[PDB]
């Protein structure tokens, strides 16, 4: 038994990103959400068949907020000292090795997390196995 702790089921209220209006048509508008402000904008008045707005009712359950599908919360780790902070929380958190960590330092982190029983999200990036 090495897994996450007993958590209530993760329910995502909406799995699709809120896309900015008319971002599909104009390349200058990024898809990042901007609230419409024209008084005759059909998205703003919320007619049917249009894009929905983000709202606090979409907010995820506070027990399962920030939880990965396995049940863990991601923890950004830069060296071996950061993994040891997860010694008491090896069932709630998972080690996410930062993107600017070298090859050798990753193997030191990956070895340490195995000894501590801490899940690593990216354990096969700059490494390989030699027999």
């Amino acid at each position: 038994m090495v897994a996450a702790k007993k958590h209530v089921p993760i329910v995502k209220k909406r799995t699709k990103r809120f896309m900015r209006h008319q971002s599909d048509r104009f390349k200058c508008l990024d898809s990042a959400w901007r609230k419409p402000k024209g008084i005759d904008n059909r998205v703003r008045r919320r007619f049917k068949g249009n894009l929905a707005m983000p709202s606090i009712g979409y907010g995820s359950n506070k027990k399962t907020k920030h939880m990965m599908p396995s049940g863990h919360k991601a923890f950004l780790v830069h060296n071996v000292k950061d993994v040891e902070l997860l010694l008491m929380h090896n069932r709630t958190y998972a080690a996410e090795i930062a993107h600017n960590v070298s090859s050798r330092k990753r193997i030191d982190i990956i070895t340490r997390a195995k000894q501590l029983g801490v899940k690593v999200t990216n354990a096969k990036a700059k490494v390989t196995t030699e027999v």
């Binding site: 390989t128 196995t129 030699e130 027999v131």
Partner: protein, 347 residues
């Protein structure tokens, strides 16, 4: 402009570009007339064309190869083995160090076992590698995800008991074959011999190759090309030991391992001998062109095998590093310091 950089002598960028454009128009015009006057004079007197060609010849990294200008062979010395015997007339170190590969008579029908990396997912790539070598079977390393984690040392003991000759492990990266570990199990009482790990870089299956074909069960003919060093002679004999010694020369299947500058290019073709088509040129040989006796017939080729490029990284005494236990446990270990100069070819 060959000895001076216009960037480090003219600070204004735009003035430098026009002077270089004027340089390109001048030199390209000058080279055209100089080569055209040479072509005019070559037509009258063709002897000077023979003199120009033999004196001015293009450079080659192969012809600038650096050998260890010394004696001795120790599986780490870059030296032409064949030129050493020719100098001696005017490899004992390999046979003593590796009695099993370089013995008198190999086992007649080698039995080969191919397995994958542990909890691997490259089953279709490993089975095609198993079809490369005749009399080879594929067994997955782990049955389930949560199954027993058999070691390479164990499987080498298991397959030697059953009667296999070699054990091949294809190690994966990015769900693609990346390393080939070749283990020699041998027979009777001698221990499992040397382990040769390689790197599979440009893997392409036969299905990806346009105009390919199937392979028949005929034993192929082995072509081990351009192996000269003591290390290369071991890599050549190791690939020799996997294949049957007597080829069934009716399937017309050829498996080649060509060593160009420590890159072992692997192919598998099938051929037919045919008369040359009238617009086709005769097959030339190097230094002795217009290959005699064979004049006017050409050997066609159709690929039937995987594309891959191998490079030798480590050779060990036993099975892996953990399995080679003496003080000569690592025989030759590739490091990037050896490829520091482009004319140092290890094998």
């Amino acid at each position: 402009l060959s000895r001076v950089s216009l960037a480090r002598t003219i600070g204004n960028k735009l003035k430098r570009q026009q002077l270089y454009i004027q340089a390109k128009k001048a030199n390209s015009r000058a080279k055209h007339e100089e080569r055209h006057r040479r072509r005019k004079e070559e037509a009258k007197n063709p002897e000077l064309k023979q003199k120009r060609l033999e004196k001015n010849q293009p450079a080659s990294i192969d012809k600038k190869r650096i050998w260890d200008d010394l004696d001795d062979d120790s599986l780490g010395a870059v030296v032409d083995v064949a030129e050493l015997k020719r100098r001696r007339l005017e490899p004992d170190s390999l046979t003593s160090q590796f009695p099993n590969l370089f013995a008198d008579e190999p086992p007649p029908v080698p039995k080969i076992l191919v397995t994958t990396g542990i909890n691997g997912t490259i089953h279709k790539e490993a089975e095609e590698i198993a079809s490369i070598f005749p009399n080879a079977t594929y067994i997955r390393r782990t049955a389930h995800r949560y199954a027993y984690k058999y070691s390479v040392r164990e499987i080498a003991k298991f397959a030697k008991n059953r009667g296999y000759t070699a054990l091949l492990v294809v190690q994966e990266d990015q769900k693609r074959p990346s390393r080939l570990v070749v283990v020699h199990l041998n027979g009777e009482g001698v221990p499992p011999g040397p382990t040769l790990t390689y790197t599979i870089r440009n893997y392409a299956p036969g299905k990806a190759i346009p105009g390919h074909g199937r392979a028949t069960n005929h034993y192929p003919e082995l072509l081990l090309n351009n192996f000269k060093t003591p290390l290369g002679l071991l890599a050549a004999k190791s690939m020799h030991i996997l294949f049957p010694s007597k080829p069934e020369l009716a399937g017309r299947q050829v498996v080649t391992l060509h060593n160009q500058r420590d890159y072992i290019f692997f192919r598998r073709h099938r051929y037919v001998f045919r008369e040359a088509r009238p617009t086709e040129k005769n097959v030339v040989g190097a230094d002795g062109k217009e290959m005699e006796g064979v004049k006017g017939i050409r050997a066609g080729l159709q690929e039937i095998g995987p594309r891959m490029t191998l490079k030798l990284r480590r050779v060990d005494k036993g099975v892996g590093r953990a399995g080679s236990e003496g003080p000569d446990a690592v025989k030759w270990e590739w490091k990037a310091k050896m490829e520091k100069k482009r004319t140092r070819f290890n094998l």
